[PDB]
Structure formats: structure tokens, C-alpha cells
Chain A
Amino acid sequence: KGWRTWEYQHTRPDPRPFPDPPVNDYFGRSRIWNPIACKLGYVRKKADEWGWPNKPPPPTGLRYSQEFFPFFFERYFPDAEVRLLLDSVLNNETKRPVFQIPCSMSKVELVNYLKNIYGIDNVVRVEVRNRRGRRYKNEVGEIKMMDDYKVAVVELDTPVSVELKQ
């Protein structure tokens, strides 16, 4: 038996189980990165790399070579935020300071960083731990979360310290 389909205007209703937005609203400790890639990611990547669509795309050789601007700038003008935890070397002579490393660096990369940018040439070993970014809530109750980091305990040869004048 058919329905009275001549009484409804041709508009599509909403499905009964309404889908949740793809945006992840959970900011806890088990936050999951979404493996699914969307069109907007590629669009923004092209527009950031070679000014799509106002500029013609560079040839495949330049795009896949080390001279492409992103890789060139990442090599010559590195952007790595290595910050020292003062609670380890402040008014205490310790042999293993603690650093906050971007989660993309490795132990050898951190050793090279400390050896070349600052000159720390006495590094025994590095122990790395991946920690979720520090989350908090402001006065209005909105959930904020800082960038993720990596705790790197760096063992040295000679104990170092920083003296705080009383």
C-alpha cells in the first residue's frame, strides 16, 4: 500500500539518529587523533605551500627536492621549542636535567640540538616520555589545553646547577 506522497514538498528530512559533528570535543587523557583526512587539509596545505590557486604549482622536481620552501626553511631556519625545566637545575646540583621537547623530536635530534645550539657536549643518555598537554579551565568554564610535549631526562657527565640569589 502506497503513501500519500503528493502532500509533501520535495525536501529531504533529517535522519532519525542525527550524526555527531566530526570535531572532537573530548580533551582528556585518551584523546585520539583522527586518521581520516579531509579535502580541507589538502586545500590548506597547497595554499600554504605554493599559494594555491593564485600561483602556478612548482615542478615535481622542486616539490620533491630539498629546495622546496618548507623543507629549505625547516633545515636552515629550524623551529624547535626546547625549553628547560627549572625545577631540576634551580638551586640543586643535579646530573640529569629535564627538558620539554616537541613531541616530534627524537633522542639523537635532542642531542644534536643541545650540542650545536647551546654547546652541551657531555650527554650520556636520554629518557623520553610522551605526556598529554596540560589542560585547564578558565573563569567561564571553557576547557583549554596546551600543546603536547615530551619529558626528556638528559643524563650528563658533570653535575650542573643554577644558583638563585636569595
Chain B
Amino acid sequence: YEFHEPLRRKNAEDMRQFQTDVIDMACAMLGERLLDTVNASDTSSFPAEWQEAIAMHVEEIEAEMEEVAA
């Protein structure tokens, strides 16, 4: 048991991290599809605070891109 337990423990941690990565990739793809639907269709936008936070994060990401470029 002292030999075999760490292996199943690592397997359980791998399953937990797999579920976490599934959730994260699903969130990323959900954001992608929502943005695509918004910029494609008409009269389908985000709430006020949502748009404000999205614009702020876009500004931050563009600043980070300019920093890693220069």
C-alpha cells in the first residue's frame, strides 16, 4: 500500500485537474462564441457593467501586447 497509494493519488489529482481544465476551456470557448454572436448579429449586446469590464480588459491586454512587443 505504501508503494501503490501515491500512484492512485496522482491519478486522482490528474482527474481533478482534467475536470478543471475542461471547465476552463469550456469558459474560453463560451466567451469566444458569445463574442462572435455579438459582433455578428444585431441588437444583441452585453450589459453596461459587462461592456465596461470587457473594454477595460481589452485595454489591459493591448497594453500587455505593446509591452511584450517593445
Question: Are A and B in direct contact (Cβ within 8 Å)?
Answer: no
